[PDB]
Amino acid sequence: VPESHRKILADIADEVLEKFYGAGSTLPADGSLEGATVLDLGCGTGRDVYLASKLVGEHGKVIGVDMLDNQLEVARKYVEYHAEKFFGSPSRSNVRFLKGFIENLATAEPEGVPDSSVDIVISNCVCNLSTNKLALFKEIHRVLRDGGELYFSDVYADRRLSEAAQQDPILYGECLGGALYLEDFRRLVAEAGFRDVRLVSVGPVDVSDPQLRKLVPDVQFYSCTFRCFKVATLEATREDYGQSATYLGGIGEEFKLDRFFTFPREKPVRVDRNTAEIIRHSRLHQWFSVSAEQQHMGLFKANDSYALLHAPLSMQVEQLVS
Ligand SMILES: [Ca+2]
């Protein structure tokens, strides 16, 4: 748990924490959250929604969605609690909890999530149980506004699982069975509209049980945090138009966009046009200066890991580990 969060977690109602299923949805840098609308897919008892509530402040909004009666009944009955503790009155809540399938957010209950309404969509380990991954990615792209982002963690594999592994119940329930090969992930998400997938962090996932392991003998699984911006001008490739971006301060000593780009306070960093556009069209614009497009110079090479920046996801994931 990030230090900045511990105090806020100490304030969240014990019953929310005690009954929360799963690991926490990781959040972008806290400062970047101010005033954002954030949606948590598979929100459970609301741990992450309530943490976001505080961080987005009273101008922001937070939405939780889940299909477990159950955990939502608990989420819903602590809204006032948390408005008082964060904003001084039972009546100033900026959260709501919706009941529904995450693959169809338009029909969730009491109200749907409309088109182009969310700045950040977060989730941890919801995809590999999903019934249609494409439909989930398309629904995310729908609810995001331009410049918004899916900032999420899930389990992926370094190769395509066999049919026998995809059918196994214990593998399925551990979010391994339904894991995509990273490259299949990248095509699928692009088919949904996300043309540029940025690696934030990766951890190994191990199958130690030798019976399970025999179904997936040499497969390497990873827990990957990716960020996928919805920005109309992104291309499939990472092109140099001569630009530089400069982090102006305000949300930390330095801003780490992904594993290739870190921006120190007031130091110009050369960027590809995709990165320049993400910065310009997302909420991040508020803390950056981005220089104007020159003439095209070819593929972007002005990064000390440029070869990896252009390589398949597999290769990026495997080296950030090694
Ligand atoms: Ca969750």
Q: In this structure, are residues 30 and 16 in contact, taking their beta carbons and an 8 Å threshold?
A: no
Question: Does residue 44 have a known ligand-binding role?
Answer: no
The CA 246 to ligand 1 mean position distance, Å, reads: 34
Paired with 229 in beta bridges are 149
The CA 124 to ligand 1 mean position distance, Å, reads: 5
Task: Please tell me whether residue 314 adopts helix, strand or coil conformation.
Answer: helix
Paired with 287 in beta bridges are none
Question: Does residue 156 have a known ligand-binding role?
Answer: no
Paired with 157 in beta bridges are 181, 221
* 182-191 helix and 313-321 helix, angle to the nearest 10 degrees: 130
Q: In this structure, are residues 76 and 45 in contact, taking their beta carbons and an 8 Å threshold?
A: no
For 89, 134, 255, the CA distances from 150, given in Å and listed in that order, are 31, 14, 18
Sign (positive or negative) of CA dihedral 104, 137, 162, 318: negative
The CA 5 to ligand 1 mean position distance, Å, reads: 16
Shortest CA distance to 62 belongs to which of 54, 72, 71? 54
Radius of gyration of the CA atoms of the chain, in A: 20
Q: Hey, how many other C-beta atoms are within 10 angstroms of the C-beta on 200?
A: 18
The CA 128 to ligand 1 mean position distance, Å, reads: 13
Which structural technique was applied? X-ray
Which residues lie closer than 8 Å to 121 by C-beta, 6 or more apart? 38, 39, 40, 41, 140, 143, 144, 148, 149, 150, 151, 152
Shortest CA distance to 291 belongs to which of 234, 226, 216, 241? 241
Residue type, 282: S
Question: Does residue 119 have a known ligand-binding role?
Answer: no
The CA 266 to ligand 1 mean position distance, Å, reads: 36
Give CA–CA dist 216/221, Å, rounded.
10
* 79-87 helix and 47-56 helix, angle to the nearest 10 degrees: 30
Q: Hey, how many other C-beta atoms are within 10 angstroms of the C-beta on 154?
A: 21
Give CA–CA dist 228/9, Å, rounded.
27
CATH superfamily of the domain spanning 1-236 = Vaccinia Virus protein VP39 (3.40.50.150)
* Residue 218: CA count within 13 A, CB half-sphere: 1
Give CA–CA dist 244/272, Å, rounded.
8
The CA 45 to ligand 1 mean position distance, Å, reads: 9
Give CA–CA dist 296/278, Å, rounded.
18
Take residue 92 and report the two structure tokens written for it: 């100033």
DSSP code of 286? Answer: G
**181-194 per-residue burial string, b: 16 or more CB within 10 A, e: under 16:** bbeebbebbeebbb
Question: Does residue 102 have a known ligand-binding role?
Answer: yes
The CA 49 to ligand 1 mean position distance, Å, reads: 9
Domain ranges of the chain: 1-236, 237-322
Give CA–CA dist 198/211, Å, rounded.
34
Q: Hey, how many other C-beta atoms are within 10 angstroms of the C-beta on 198?
A: 21
The CA 134 to ligand 1 mean position distance, Å, reads: 20
CATH architecture label of 237-322: 3-Layer(aba) Sandwich (3.40)
